[PDB]
Design an enzyme around this catalytic site. Sequence first.
Site, mmCIF file in Angstrom:
data_model
loop_
_atom_site.group_PDB
_atom_site.id
_atom_site.type_symbol
_atom_site.label_atom_id
_atom_site.label_comp_id
_atom_site.label_asym_id
_atom_site.label_seq_id
_atom_site.Cartn_x
_atom_site.Cartn_y
_atom_site.Cartn_z
ATOM 1 N N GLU A 221 70.329 -50.522 -133.321
ATOM 2 C CA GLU A 221 71.212 -50.480 -134.688
ATOM 3 C C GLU A 221 70.793 -51.655 -135.457
ATOM 4 O O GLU A 221 71.079 -51.946 -136.468
ATOM 5 C CB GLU A 221 72.575 -50.320 -134.212
ATOM 6 C CG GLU A 221 72.801 -49.096 -133.538
ATOM 7 C CD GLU A 221 72.992 -47.744 -134.652
ATOM 8 O OE1 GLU A 221 72.509 -48.055 -135.565
ATOM 9 O OE2 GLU A 221 73.149 -46.588 -134.027
ATOM 10 N N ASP B 244 72.562 -46.651 -144.010
ATOM 11 C CA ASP B 244 72.014 -46.548 -143.198
ATOM 12 C C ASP B 244 70.978 -45.321 -143.200
ATOM 13 O O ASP B 244 70.827 -45.058 -144.342
ATOM 14 C CB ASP B 244 73.228 -45.794 -141.926
ATOM 15 C CG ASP B 244 73.453 -44.244 -142.221
ATOM 16 O OD1 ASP B 244 73.347 -43.701 -143.293
ATOM 17 O OD2 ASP B 244 74.205 -43.932 -141.381
#
Length: 162
Positions: free
Chosen positions: A11, A20
């Site tokens: 991440e 994202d």
Amino acid sequence: MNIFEMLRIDEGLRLKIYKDTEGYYTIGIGHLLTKSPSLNAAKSELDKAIGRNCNGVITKDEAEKLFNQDVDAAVRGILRNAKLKPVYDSLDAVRRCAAINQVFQMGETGVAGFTNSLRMLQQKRWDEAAVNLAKSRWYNQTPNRAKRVITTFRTGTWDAYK
Ligand SMILES: Nc1ccccc1F
Ligand SMILES: [Cl-]
Ligand SMILES: [Cl-]
């Protein structure tokens, strides 16, 4: 290697609101804030989560705190799911980290339509499951990450994370 290091690698870490891979507002260590396209909604959600007016920015400790709570929630999600639990409890420790990673990324929901792969994992047909898992939007959208988790499930070792 443990779940935290693994997800930290997948991440990354960002202290300012970002979008994202799907274009949604997130922060920290993959902490999804909202699916809405409104920055202001994302900032509001951020403040609610941190407990203060952040103005789109948080500290590392704050990020780490959100991370802890999110890993926790993911596992708990798994244990509470009737279709997930039995699979998860049949796996060894490394492969359990790969199940948490997938859930962290896609949600218990995302992961529940992997029914066929779930069955192969439960039967411990590793190579078969690995091929099945690759046949998904998940692998086609985020191949590099998907490859690491898939190897993880196929081998039961941390080789893909070096
Ligand atoms: N992949 C997966 C996800 C959650 C629980 C068990 C699993 F096998
Ligand atoms: Cl929170
Ligand atoms: Cl990727």
